[PDB]
Structure 1
């Protein structure tokens, strides 16, 4: 049937760092998610392997694009 939603209600509106493919990092605040793990976050900062943080604001990452997540608070 319909897949179960991920348990991220406690992770809402919190500082989180998400590691995605290409060894990319995104530090932001969780704003919403979906059943297919489509995460929408605000005040996103993208970090490459060089260690440079680039602000993007409101960003969206697909479920397949998301690899690992870790709360920063």
Structure 2
């Protein structure tokens, strides 16, 4: 019932899924955020969707700790 941010605050220390505009999605364990949707992830694994010569391909990276700037964020939900 609280603003969508509060629901996002419900997910702290949990695995979150974050969607970015540029055909990239992340799933990881959320540690912090502000109202601009800037985010710190603690054990995320990124996955990138591409267009290569009429085939869909998906490479992925993982890292221990990453700040991610909010203005790229298009959606959030549980893994």
TM over 0.5, shorter chain: yes
Of 51, 55, 61, 2:58 maps to 51
Moved over 3 A (4+): none
Alignment of 1:12 onto 2:19: no
The gaps in structure 1 that reach 5 residues or longer are none
Q: Which has the higher helix share?
A: 2
Pick the structure with greater CA Rg. 2
Deviation string for 1:38-71 (max 9, x for gaps)?
Answer: 1111111110112333112211222211111111
Question: Cα RMSD (Å) of the superposition?
Answer: 1.8
- TM-score norm. by structure 2 comes to 0.74
**Larger strand percent:** 2
Query: What runs of 5+ residues in structure 2 fail to find an aligned partner?
Result: 50-56
Structure-1-length-normalised TM-score = 0.79
